[PDB]
Design a protein around this ligand. Sequence first.
Ligand SMILES: COc1ccccc1OC1CN(C(=O)c2cc(=O)[nH]c3ccccc23)C1
Ligand SMILES: COc1ccccc1OC1CN(C(=O)c2cc(=O)[nH]c3ccccc23)C1
Lengths: 304, 304
Amino acid sequence: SGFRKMAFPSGKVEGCMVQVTCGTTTLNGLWLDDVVYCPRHVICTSEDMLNPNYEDLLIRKSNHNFLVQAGNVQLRVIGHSMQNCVLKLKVDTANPKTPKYKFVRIQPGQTFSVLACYNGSPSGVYQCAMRPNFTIKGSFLNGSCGSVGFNIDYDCVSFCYMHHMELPTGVHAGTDLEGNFYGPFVDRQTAQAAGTDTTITVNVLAWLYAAVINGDRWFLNRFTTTLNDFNLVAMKYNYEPLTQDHVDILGPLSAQTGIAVLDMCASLKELLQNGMNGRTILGSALLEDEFTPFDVVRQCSGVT
Amino acid sequence: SGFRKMAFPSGKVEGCMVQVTCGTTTLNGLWLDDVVYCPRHVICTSEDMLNPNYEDLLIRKSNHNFLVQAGNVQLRVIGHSMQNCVLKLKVDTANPKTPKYKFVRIQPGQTFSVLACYNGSPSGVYQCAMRPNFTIKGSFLNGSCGSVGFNIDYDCVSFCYMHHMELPTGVHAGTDLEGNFYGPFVDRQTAQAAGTDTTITVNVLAWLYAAVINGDRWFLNRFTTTLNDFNLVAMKYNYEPLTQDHVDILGPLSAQTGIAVLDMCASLKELLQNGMNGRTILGSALLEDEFTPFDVVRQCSGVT
Ligand SMILES: COc1ccccc1OC1CN(C(=O)c2cc(=O)[nH]c3ccccc23)C1
Ligand SMILES: COc1ccccc1OC1CN(C(=O)c2cc(=O)[nH]c3ccccc23)C1
């Protein structure tokens, strides 16, 4: 029993973190096989970030200008290329600690673990979600760029995020490992405002199922609803519309608890309309939306 | 910017997790040097747990009855001993991945990371705190015993917790790595109820400082208070009394924000008396108490 915001064990990813320095800029790189991936803004000065022409800036850089250090040892850079917003630095040594890995591009609502790093050294691990506005609510300071987001399926690490920037509102933007930003964000110091940060309805419902599994049942009511009726309420509360795909995804949690998905929707509808009344659910006074249905099943079953 | 419930990178501890089986019971062990530490209840059947005489049960066990497996490979047990509520299984091979380590006994209010494991394999990592009633609010299922809690200071892992049991209320109890339970708990299936789970005041204040550092400042007010006046309110709200030692510990956060500790106490006093009014602080609708002042400084400075 108990339900925590749990991250994947970070060891497999710690073994991939390196420091990348270009000129006076130092950030993190991800070393997989003989390639080190890092944000292309490592080549920029603070003045360059206002309106950078990455292709032009990159012309002034040679392999020897990219200093890559894995622990206390230097890696030899034998090639470099830009792929979208990431640089790929080919090194002469394959990372001996390279885990089985995939590069995946996640959809909003999906969760992942972040290993926050500074100077190629891991500082902490936390769980977050790709928000519906394509930002993440992370915890990143100066030097954190190049820190990665990932999921683990037994022994395969699926990298889904590389950290690039922080918007003025304190939220974060980054790319997949192909260098494509999530959402409309660009690696420039310009006016970039995030859209509405809607609540991930399917994740809230999964977390309500986790609450029932873990004994918190005060919010269960005598009502039901329809997808259309629920969605009228969801729209009013800036929640994402619930689809039949989401209902199907909640099937296993509905089966485990014996609570029909639409009955849980009616409980969530009442919580939205009436509030919590000073009560808590799984130690939270708000409806938590950064646990997917897969996360709830995983945590409640003990997948290693 | 941003503030997350962050755990330490778990790699150093993943390298220590093994599976320990005695008879039909399987749980986790911690392999450091040539010793594997695990809960002594690995020798019990479910019927034994009602009123176990561990010394008597242990007489029926020999080294060859303790099956220790590190990954897919078996470790040879050449000795065994009971120290309080843990067993120490001496193996013939030192763990090659043994990090620099210490065994520490933490005080209530202190936080640590837990690497939840099943069958010697890590499943997830989360952050928690030793509660003032000596329970932890973890996330543990069948087979999680022997999972450990730790802190990391650069390259030294200070192990502080080993998981032993879950109380009927869904909260957890365990020992330090010397086998002494935190609090009054015993490794028996008997009526053991937890005491008042008071709020760790000094941690709430640290988290309010984190909120100011990260831009959430709506709760700052025009008032101040004294330690004695604040403590009258703290007692009423089941908060731990704030001492001058706690005020001194908050000194660096007070210096960083320019907000005197007693002024922050007055803001916390108003939040307790008036509530949040549907507002949030660092994405929470309740006052968070599982970040110590050291955690706040660490997260806000980027210690690796
Ligand atoms: C002027 O630099 C940029 C401007 C616009 C875009 C990118 C720029 O650079 C990169 C951003 N980054 C950081 O280190 C960083 C990332 C972060 O998430 N939080 C921070 C908090 C405080 C100070 C820095 C950061 C480098
Ligand atoms: C009957 O066993 C005990 C009774 C009293 C005391 C100890 C007993 O054993 C040990 C407890 N433990 C577990 O695996 C466990 C630990 C946990 O934190 N959560 C659980 C949830 C569901 C099922 C089991 C657990 C073994």
